[PDB]
Design a protein around this ligand. Structure first.
Ligand SMILES: [Mg+2]
Ligand SMILES: [Mg+2]
Lengths: 136, 136
């Protein structure tokens, strides 16, 4: 209503997983995710350890709408395709998803005030789902 | 013939500016540019100081053809639009070009065995044209 504008409302901002990290500091890094709006439907995305200024992960995305059901967070490296479930946006990487030469599988859940991400590399594997809460 | 396939032939590979750097080492860094083909019309691009393994600049691009005259090296951060001159591909950044929050102006020339680049930041300025020669 429109779906893409609602997505962008939820998607934009700064998120961090303090509660997750603090609750098991030896398992989960404390990471800050920033989705900064450049233009309408254009965001600069980045992830950083909270004690660092420089992100370890960084790119710019276009937000595309594919009628009727889909929101695509687009980058040539890896599109993430979101569907509205009735409660949140559920996202999954396209098949050809790669970071920097490594096949990647990504999942994401976008809520009104949380962003959950799940990234798995062919060789490097994964830690599981990060739970990022959106900052005020 | 087709123009986009010729572009991709010239664009793909590894380039470095040894002669430029060596000739004035206090002015020009020795940098290696790699254009690695992931898929048809899909490349992973990176620039690194030659003594480093990790690039300082890194992204994935889609190669798009816009009939009749244009080749677009696409990334949501900054499209570079190339025209065939009769001798080489001349490239210029789209107006909305940004790296990571800084307005950027980019120019490039793509030859059969060289790649020249020119990047200017709003605040940081520029060094001028880098002269990268394509490695065998
Ligand atoms: Mg793609
Ligand atoms: Mg664009």
């Amino acid at each position: 209503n429109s779906m893409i504008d609602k997505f962008c409302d939820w998607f934009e901002g700064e998120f961090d997983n303090w509660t997750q990290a603090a609750s098991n500091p030896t398992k989960w890094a404390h990471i800050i995710v920033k989705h900064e709006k450049i233009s309408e439907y254009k965001y600069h995305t980045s992830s950083r350890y909270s004690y660092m200024d420089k992100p370890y992960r960084e790119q710019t995305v276009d937000i595309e709408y594919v009628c009727p059901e889909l929101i695509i967070v687009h980058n040539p490296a890896c599109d993430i395709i979101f569907k509205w479930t009735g409660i949140y946006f559920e996202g999954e990487s396209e098949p050809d998803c790669q970071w920097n030469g490594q096949p990647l599988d990504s999942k994401a859940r976008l809520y009104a005030d949380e962003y959950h991400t799940w990234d798995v590399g062919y060789w490097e594997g994964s830690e599981g789902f990060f739970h990022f809460k959106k900052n005020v």
